């Protein structure tokens, strides 16, 4: 943390953050969400990290170079250490990236190495080559070299993500799935795991072996698993919570803006809220059905009337303000909602649905007051505008993600936030073979458009291809875009270090501090 001159620090440097839900896991290769990444950044540190404003900056790697954007050489700092005092080396990275690639690990982020194009990843994911063939090597204990199959000018931006953080081989091997328990875990971030009580709390304590420990200020941070946005606000206002999770309750938001304006933080956020259709399950394998659902949802009602927290109506998957996004707004987005409704009803009628045999399906969401209120609204809108019936279902976060990966669903609410600020952070997740493809969407045309983006050595042609890829996704109605998020949360006035400038919201508790109050 960089405490400004003149700031008086509180005697007790402890922080309590709400984290939305119980995490899927503390193993960097088994996680896929925001609650998981929030804790992961305090515990595991990769090659690069985001600074307090979100820029890619030195992590375990103090400096790096690239040859033709294809061979990347990372010089690791000599004092990087794990919490048990042992050095973090390039061999840790070699093992870790191999473990991420290995199909036996079944990582939801195995395809992150395809997004970066590390050599031999396609064959390793397919079981054709062992994970030890991955294009990574430790040239010495402090030098990690990565070899890509084609030039990727933005490759280093990928490296702040939890999936490419190191994991401690000795603990993994000796304890298997219990390696992350407090008695067994070993970490290399600013913090160490002190306690983990499922559905109660995760408590982290400062890691004295962290190389940048002298600048860490918070000595302990607690992450809670509260999925009720009302309860989160309540426990924030009672004094227990210093930072809410970034899901705000529809019941209280307008009043909070009038009552504690300076604590209500609202900033840009590279995430899209949408309804994820299971593209492989009848009748959702019919484009007319997906198109009808997409058009009949009234974004103005959801964004401005129901939620009304500053979000923007969406017509794409990739947020239009992503670095490199130059998207074309489809004509259907400028139509009236009545024109959208008629087209929707016409398409559903063409697909075989009638008043006597209407379309009925499930709408799955992760337990949350905000997502329930939005799903109820979407249900009413779809019923009114299109004559479709929906059965709402809630599942706790970990179960919900597993369900979507399994494809045991019809339609599910969904949010995707960027992992790196570049359109492929969204677009690669819709590739046929992506481990992140929970839409179960497979389009050779879309795959080809994205494959072409790194074949050209030009940025503007690249932006045009991303735009065409989005048009292909839209033409197929792979998803139902709802809104581009704003990041809204409450932060106590005595929590220093949180700018709100990072559009990825990659917070590190090592950067924060408690001001005397």
Tab-separated table of C-alpha atoms in Angstrom, residues 6-313:
chain	number	residue	atom	x	y	z
A	6	UNK	CA	-0.209	13.192	6.470
A	7	UNK	CA	-2.738	10.342	6.648
A	8	UNK	CA	-3.123	9.065	10.194
A	9	UNK	CA	-3.431	5.258	10.273
A	10	UNK	CA	-5.773	3.416	12.601
A	11	UNK	CA	-4.111	1.397	15.341
A	12	UNK	CA	-5.888	-1.791	14.246
A	13	UNK	CA	-5.346	-2.534	10.565
A	14	UNK	CA	-8.082	-5.093	9.937
A	15	UNK	CA	-10.624	-5.301	7.162
A	16	UNK	CA	-13.879	-7.151	6.627
A	17	UNK	CA	-15.159	-7.581	3.071
A	18	UNK	CA	-18.329	-9.307	1.959
A	19	UNK	CA	-17.550	-11.728	-0.911
A	20	UNK	CA	-21.017	-12.647	-2.207
A	21	UNK	CA	-20.893	-16.394	-1.666
A	22	UNK	CA	-18.948	-19.391	-0.435
A	23	UNK	CA	-16.009	-19.864	-2.824
A	24	UNK	CA	-15.809	-22.791	-5.221
A	25	UNK	CA	-12.290	-23.472	-3.994
A	26	UNK	CA	-9.015	-21.835	-2.945
A	27	UNK	CA	-7.083	-23.826	-5.604
A	28	UNK	CA	-6.213	-21.456	-8.464
A	29	UNK	CA	-6.776	-24.183	-11.082
A	30	UNK	CA	-10.289	-25.070	-9.870
A	31	UNK	CA	-11.890	-21.607	-9.832
A	32	UNK	CA	-13.781	-19.507	-12.341
A	33	UNK	CA	-15.520	-16.649	-10.534
A	34	UNK	CA	-15.222	-13.227	-8.921
A	35	UNK	CA	-15.681	-14.375	-5.289
A	36	UNK	CA	-12.947	-16.939	-5.941
A	37	UNK	CA	-10.611	-14.480	-7.635
A	38	UNK	CA	-11.125	-11.931	-4.876
A	39	UNK	CA	-9.546	-14.243	-2.300
A	40	UNK	CA	-7.025	-15.715	-4.789
A	41	UNK	CA	-5.344	-12.336	-5.440
A	42	UNK	CA	-4.467	-11.989	-1.707
A	43	UNK	CA	-3.027	-15.508	-1.542
A	44	UNK	CA	-1.359	-16.415	-4.856
A	45	UNK	CA	0.779	-14.110	-6.959
A	46	UNK	CA	1.624	-14.727	-10.611
A	47	UNK	CA	4.186	-13.248	-12.994
A	48	UNK	CA	2.498	-9.839	-13.120
A	49	UNK	CA	-0.191	-8.208	-10.900
A	50	UNK	CA	-2.464	-5.177	-11.461
A	51	UNK	CA	-1.329	-1.976	-9.735
A	52	UNK	CA	-3.920	0.030	-7.755
A	53	UNK	CA	-5.338	1.499	-11.016
A	54	UNK	CA	-5.439	-1.847	-12.842
A	55	UNK	CA	-2.332	-1.597	-15.049
A	56	UNK	CA	-0.357	-4.828	-15.543
A	57	UNK	CA	2.740	-4.437	-13.352
A	58	UNK	CA	5.542	-6.505	-11.844
A	59	UNK	CA	4.482	-9.483	-9.711
A	60	UNK	CA	6.940	-12.386	-9.127
A	61	UNK	CA	8.507	-11.221	-12.406
A	62	UNK	CA	10.398	-7.976	-11.922
A	63	UNK	CA	11.114	-7.560	-15.621
A	64	UNK	CA	10.330	-9.249	-18.918
A	65	UNK	CA	11.071	-9.073	-22.633
A	66	UNK	CA	9.541	-10.572	-25.774
A	67	UNK	CA	10.972	-11.703	-29.109
A	68	UNK	CA	8.456	-11.065	-31.904
A	69	UNK	CA	5.588	-11.338	-29.382
A	70	UNK	CA	6.190	-15.119	-29.525
A	71	UNK	CA	8.873	-15.899	-26.958
A	72	UNK	CA	8.320	-14.208	-23.601
A	73	UNK	CA	11.109	-14.170	-21.008
A	74	UNK	CA	10.287	-13.359	-17.404
A	75	UNK	CA	13.018	-12.473	-14.923
A	76	UNK	CA	11.797	-13.488	-11.480
A	77	UNK	CA	12.801	-11.461	-8.412
A	78	UNK	CA	15.346	-13.202	-6.215
A	79	UNK	CA	13.462	-12.635	-2.957
A	80	UNK	CA	10.056	-13.977	-4.058
A	81	UNK	CA	9.122	-16.545	-1.385
A	82	UNK	CA	6.274	-18.842	-0.331
A	83	UNK	CA	4.755	-18.554	3.174
A	84	UNK	CA	6.947	-21.402	4.455
A	85	UNK	CA	10.076	-19.409	3.539
A	86	UNK	CA	11.029	-21.399	0.425
A	87	UNK	CA	11.844	-19.509	-2.774
A	88	UNK	CA	9.316	-19.084	-5.554
A	89	UNK	CA	11.150	-20.231	-8.708
A	90	UNK	CA	10.499	-20.589	-12.422
A	91	UNK	CA	10.114	-24.362	-11.808
A	92	UNK	CA	6.999	-23.543	-9.723
A	93	UNK	CA	5.537	-21.782	-12.792
A	94	UNK	CA	6.466	-24.665	-15.094
A	95	UNK	CA	4.690	-27.189	-12.856
A	96	UNK	CA	1.723	-24.901	-12.301
A	97	UNK	CA	1.032	-24.091	-15.951
A	98	UNK	CA	1.449	-27.785	-16.796
A	99	UNK	CA	-1.074	-28.720	-14.097
A	100	UNK	CA	-3.497	-26.114	-15.473
A	101	UNK	CA	-3.159	-27.620	-18.977
A	102	UNK	CA	-3.569	-31.232	-17.864
A	103	UNK	CA	-7.018	-32.615	-18.592
A	104	UNK	CA	-6.887	-34.619	-15.372
A	105	UNK	CA	-7.010	-31.328	-13.428
A	106	UNK	CA	-10.242	-30.481	-15.282
A	107	UNK	CA	-9.707	-26.752	-14.771
A	108	UNK	CA	-12.551	-24.492	-15.923
A	109	UNK	CA	-9.681	-22.240	-17.090
A	110	UNK	CA	-7.665	-24.877	-18.981
A	111	UNK	CA	-8.418	-22.844	-22.147
A	112	UNK	CA	-6.755	-19.742	-20.695
A	113	UNK	CA	-3.532	-21.285	-22.094
A	114	UNK	CA	-5.242	-21.531	-25.540
A	115	UNK	CA	-6.198	-17.840	-25.254
A	116	UNK	CA	-2.510	-17.017	-24.804
A	117	UNK	CA	-1.561	-19.597	-27.483
A	118	UNK	CA	1.131	-21.363	-25.462
A	119	UNK	CA	2.758	-23.952	-27.717
A	120	UNK	CA	1.208	-27.422	-27.790
A	121	UNK	CA	-1.829	-26.522	-25.656
A	122	UNK	CA	-4.469	-27.824	-28.110
A	123	UNK	CA	-2.874	-31.293	-28.161
A	124	UNK	CA	-2.426	-31.355	-24.378
A	125	UNK	CA	-6.071	-30.454	-23.739
A	126	UNK	CA	-7.079	-33.159	-26.235
A	127	UNK	CA	-5.016	-35.874	-24.462
A	128	UNK	CA	-2.716	-36.196	-27.473
A	129	UNK	CA	0.443	-34.890	-25.794
A	130	UNK	CA	1.365	-35.038	-22.129
A	131	UNK	CA	1.233	-31.772	-20.158
A	132	UNK	CA	5.038	-31.764	-19.964
A	133	UNK	CA	5.077	-30.878	-23.694
A	134	UNK	CA	3.649	-27.417	-22.877
A	135	UNK	CA	5.660	-24.512	-24.284
A	136	UNK	CA	7.088	-23.347	-20.950
A	137	UNK	CA	10.536	-23.820	-19.432
A	138	UNK	CA	12.575	-22.643	-16.469
A	139	UNK	CA	15.877	-21.498	-18.028
A	140	UNK	CA	17.183	-21.232	-14.466
A	141	UNK	CA	15.582	-20.879	-10.997
A	142	UNK	CA	14.800	-17.191	-11.710
A	143	UNK	CA	13.944	-17.254	-15.390
A	144	UNK	CA	10.656	-18.416	-16.889
A	145	UNK	CA	10.382	-18.604	-20.667
A	146	UNK	CA	7.088	-18.962	-22.517
A	147	UNK	CA	6.802	-19.966	-26.163
A	148	UNK	CA	3.674	-19.159	-28.153
A	149	UNK	CA	2.581	-20.672	-31.461
A	150	UNK	CA	1.870	-17.211	-32.981
A	151	UNK	CA	2.509	-13.581	-32.065
A	152	UNK	CA	0.317	-12.247	-29.242
A	153	UNK	CA	1.149	-8.575	-28.566
A	154	UNK	CA	-1.201	-8.463	-25.566
A	155	UNK	CA	0.001	-11.757	-23.986
A	156	UNK	CA	1.478	-10.183	-20.824
A	157	UNK	CA	-1.949	-8.643	-20.000
A	158	UNK	CA	-3.293	-12.162	-19.429
A	159	UNK	CA	-0.830	-12.880	-16.626
A	160	UNK	CA	-2.588	-11.178	-13.708
A	161	UNK	CA	-5.355	-13.879	-13.652
A	162	UNK	CA	-5.562	-16.507	-10.893
A	163	UNK	CA	-5.368	-19.454	-13.310
A	164	UNK	CA	-1.718	-18.625	-14.125
A	165	UNK	CA	-0.681	-18.147	-10.492
A	166	UNK	CA	1.725	-20.691	-9.026
A	167	UNK	CA	0.636	-23.547	-6.794
A	168	UNK	CA	2.993	-25.383	-4.401
A	169	UNK	CA	3.753	-28.813	-5.863
A	170	UNK	CA	4.827	-30.405	-2.573
A	171	UNK	CA	1.544	-29.562	-0.830
A	172	UNK	CA	-0.591	-30.453	-3.837
A	173	UNK	CA	1.045	-33.847	-4.139
A	174	UNK	CA	1.116	-34.700	-0.448
A	175	UNK	CA	-2.424	-33.560	0.441
A	176	UNK	CA	-4.334	-33.776	-2.857
A	177	UNK	CA	-7.677	-31.953	-2.551
A	178	UNK	CA	-6.980	-30.928	1.074
A	179	UNK	CA	-3.828	-28.963	0.163
A	180	UNK	CA	-5.822	-25.722	0.596
A	181	UNK	CA	-6.793	-26.413	4.237
A	182	UNK	CA	-5.161	-23.948	6.645
A	183	UNK	CA	-2.860	-26.616	8.117
A	184	UNK	CA	-1.567	-27.663	4.677
A	185	UNK	CA	-1.717	-24.644	2.383
A	186	UNK	CA	1.359	-22.670	1.298
A	187	UNK	CA	0.922	-19.271	-0.413
A	188	UNK	CA	3.089	-16.639	-2.129
A	189	UNK	CA	0.846	-13.571	-2.059
A	190	UNK	CA	0.725	-10.802	0.547
A	191	UNK	CA	-1.486	-12.953	2.806
A	192	UNK	CA	-1.704	-16.473	4.229
A	193	UNK	CA	-4.776	-18.464	5.126
A	194	UNK	CA	-5.564	-18.390	8.829
A	195	UNK	CA	-9.100	-19.821	9.089
A	196	UNK	CA	-11.712	-21.197	6.693
A	197	UNK	CA	-15.187	-21.940	8.043
A	198	UNK	CA	-17.505	-22.970	5.213
A	199	UNK	CA	-20.489	-20.642	4.920
A	200	UNK	CA	-19.171	-18.424	7.710
A	201	UNK	CA	-15.827	-16.792	7.002
A	202	UNK	CA	-12.416	-16.877	5.380
A	203	UNK	CA	-9.758	-15.098	7.445
A	204	UNK	CA	-6.369	-14.206	5.948
A	205	UNK	CA	-3.350	-12.893	7.859
A	206	UNK	CA	-0.319	-11.032	6.587
A	207	UNK	CA	2.371	-13.235	4.994
A	208	UNK	CA	5.728	-12.093	6.409
A	209	UNK	CA	7.644	-13.952	3.665
A	210	UNK	CA	5.953	-11.944	0.897
A	211	UNK	CA	8.680	-10.046	-0.955
A	212	UNK	CA	6.795	-6.747	-0.726
A	213	UNK	CA	5.641	-7.300	2.872
A	214	UNK	CA	7.204	-4.059	4.170
A	215	UNK	CA	4.550	-2.101	2.188
A	216	UNK	CA	1.588	-4.253	3.306
A	217	UNK	CA	-0.540	-2.380	5.858
A	218	UNK	CA	-3.664	-4.461	6.576
A	219	UNK	CA	-2.711	-7.266	8.969
A	220	UNK	CA	-5.871	-9.337	8.629
A	221	UNK	CA	-8.754	-9.431	6.165
A	222	UNK	CA	-11.935	-11.450	6.544
A	223	UNK	CA	-14.004	-12.486	3.502
A	224	UNK	CA	-17.693	-13.279	4.222
A	225	UNK	CA	-20.082	-15.374	2.087
A	226	UNK	CA	-23.316	-13.366	2.318
A	227	UNK	CA	-25.457	-13.649	-0.837
A	228	UNK	CA	-28.272	-11.423	0.451
A	229	UNK	CA	-27.402	-7.904	-0.772
A	230	UNK	CA	-29.742	-6.463	1.886
A	231	UNK	CA	-27.921	-8.273	4.703
A	232	UNK	CA	-24.563	-7.211	3.294
A	233	UNK	CA	-25.679	-3.560	3.375
A	234	UNK	CA	-27.178	-4.051	6.829
A	235	UNK	CA	-23.970	-5.522	8.301
A	236	UNK	CA	-21.964	-2.782	6.566
A	237	UNK	CA	-24.169	-0.081	8.151
A	238	UNK	CA	-24.107	-1.787	11.567
A	239	UNK	CA	-20.289	-1.493	11.559
A	240	UNK	CA	-19.315	-5.137	10.919
A	241	UNK	CA	-18.431	-4.857	7.208
A	242	UNK	CA	-15.973	-2.334	5.784
A	243	UNK	CA	-16.527	-3.149	2.087
A	244	UNK	CA	-19.724	-4.739	0.719
A	245	UNK	CA	-19.649	-7.189	-2.169
A	246	UNK	CA	-20.442	-5.461	-5.474
A	247	UNK	CA	-24.052	-6.620	-5.895
A	248	UNK	CA	-26.365	-3.841	-4.576
A	249	UNK	CA	-29.935	-4.444	-3.351
A	250	UNK	CA	-32.843	-2.982	-5.342
A	251	UNK	CA	-34.677	-2.365	-2.071
A	252	UNK	CA	-32.130	0.093	-0.645
A	253	UNK	CA	-29.878	1.530	-3.400
A	254	UNK	CA	-31.756	4.754	-4.148
A	255	UNK	CA	-31.955	5.548	-0.396
A	256	UNK	CA	-28.256	4.761	0.108
A	257	UNK	CA	-27.328	7.283	-2.600
A	258	UNK	CA	-29.254	9.943	-0.703
A	259	UNK	CA	-28.104	8.883	2.765
A	260	UNK	CA	-24.392	8.080	2.287
A	261	UNK	CA	-23.436	9.383	-1.157
A	262	UNK	CA	-19.706	9.453	-0.444
A	263	UNK	CA	-19.682	5.739	0.487
A	264	UNK	CA	-21.668	4.602	-2.544
A	265	UNK	CA	-18.971	3.906	-5.135
A	266	UNK	CA	-20.107	3.583	-8.765
A	267	UNK	CA	-17.459	3.165	-11.518
A	268	UNK	CA	-16.941	1.627	-14.946
A	269	UNK	CA	-16.765	-2.163	-15.001
A	270	UNK	CA	-15.939	-4.508	-17.876
A	271	UNK	CA	-18.715	-7.036	-17.293
A	272	UNK	CA	-21.887	-7.983	-19.134
A	273	UNK	CA	-25.094	-9.264	-17.541
A	274	UNK	CA	-26.984	-11.636	-19.854
A	275	UNK	CA	-29.238	-14.674	-19.970
A	276	UNK	CA	-27.133	-17.672	-20.974
A	277	UNK	CA	-29.111	-20.016	-23.236
A	278	UNK	CA	-28.128	-23.687	-23.345
A	279	UNK	CA	-27.566	-23.832	-27.108
A	280	UNK	CA	-27.426	-27.635	-27.285
A	281	UNK	CA	-30.777	-28.382	-25.677
A	282	UNK	CA	-34.056	-28.470	-27.560
A	283	UNK	CA	-35.832	-26.313	-28.063
A	284	UNK	CA	-33.039	-23.791	-27.493
A	285	UNK	CA	-31.077	-25.280	-30.417
A	286	UNK	CA	-33.564	-23.422	-32.663
A	287	UNK	CA	-32.375	-19.895	-33.543
A	288	UNK	CA	-35.971	-18.608	-33.720
A	289	UNK	CA	-36.518	-19.516	-30.060
A	290	UNK	CA	-33.267	-17.848	-28.912
A	291	UNK	CA	-33.949	-14.810	-31.118
A	292	UNK	CA	-37.477	-14.421	-29.706
A	293	UNK	CA	-36.202	-14.509	-26.130
A	294	UNK	CA	-33.468	-12.004	-27.002
A	295	UNK	CA	-35.834	-9.526	-28.632
A	296	UNK	CA	-38.773	-9.772	-26.246
A	297	UNK	CA	-36.726	-8.883	-23.168
A	298	UNK	CA	-37.212	-5.155	-22.542
A	299	UNK	CA	-33.802	-3.789	-21.534
A	300	UNK	CA	-35.067	-0.265	-20.820
A	301	UNK	CA	-37.497	-1.642	-18.202
A	302	UNK	CA	-34.826	-3.791	-16.544
A	303	UNK	CA	-32.081	-1.170	-16.584
A	304	UNK	CA	-34.007	2.040	-15.928
A	305	UNK	CA	-37.111	0.890	-14.081
A	306	UNK	CA	-36.286	-2.332	-12.205
A	307	UNK	CA	-32.586	-2.021	-11.314
A	308	UNK	CA	-31.835	1.667	-11.936
A	309	UNK	CA	-28.244	1.702	-10.646
A	310	UNK	CA	-26.557	3.202	-13.735
A	311	UNK	CA	-26.084	0.087	-15.908
A	312	UNK	CA	-26.327	0.403	-19.698
A	313	UNK	CA	-28.638	-1.636	-21.960
